[PDB]
Curated annotation (Swiss-Prot):
Name by which UniProt lists this protein: 3C-like protease
Reported effect, residue 55 to G: Complete loss of 3CLpro activity
Residue stretches making up the Peptidase C37 domain: 2-164
Transmembrane segments: none
Outcome (variant: residue 68 to G): No effect on 3CLpro activity
Phenotype for residue 55 to A: Complete loss of 3CLpro activity
Organism of this sequence: Norovirus (strain Human/NoV/United States/Norwalk/1968/GI)
Amino acid sequence: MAPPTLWSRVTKFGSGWGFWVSPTVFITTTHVVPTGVKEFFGEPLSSIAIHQAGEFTQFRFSKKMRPDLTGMVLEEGCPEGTVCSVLIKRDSGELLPLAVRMGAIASMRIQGRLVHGQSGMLLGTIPGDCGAPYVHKRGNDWVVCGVHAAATKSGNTVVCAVQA
């Protein structure tokens, strides 16, 4: 369902993953971002516009890092009832797309503060999956609406972080 180009946007990053929204914009989950380094993907921090809001982190690079990609719409979450796919890659290379029905954008306590997020109920994630994108269609275009940030103890509910 997701073409290979879409999966190719999902990229190992820090303690999890992130997602190339366009040639210059990379999104990930805040808690997976390496701390105490001076460069991401070979580019010095001073050359990257970095925005972090709760568990959503966006990097905008000063050059086309992934020119093979078209730019995708990044939404600030999505409406309750949206069916999204979480494009989970595993370190072995296995692709694990999960279909989830989303709840409403709500306040969730993740790692010591409240952040914006949306719950999803699988219509089997692990900590290392954080940063995987939640995507869906807008007509024939793919849109991305958040990044994987948490899951319930039981496992039946996932949380994606969304922009504020």
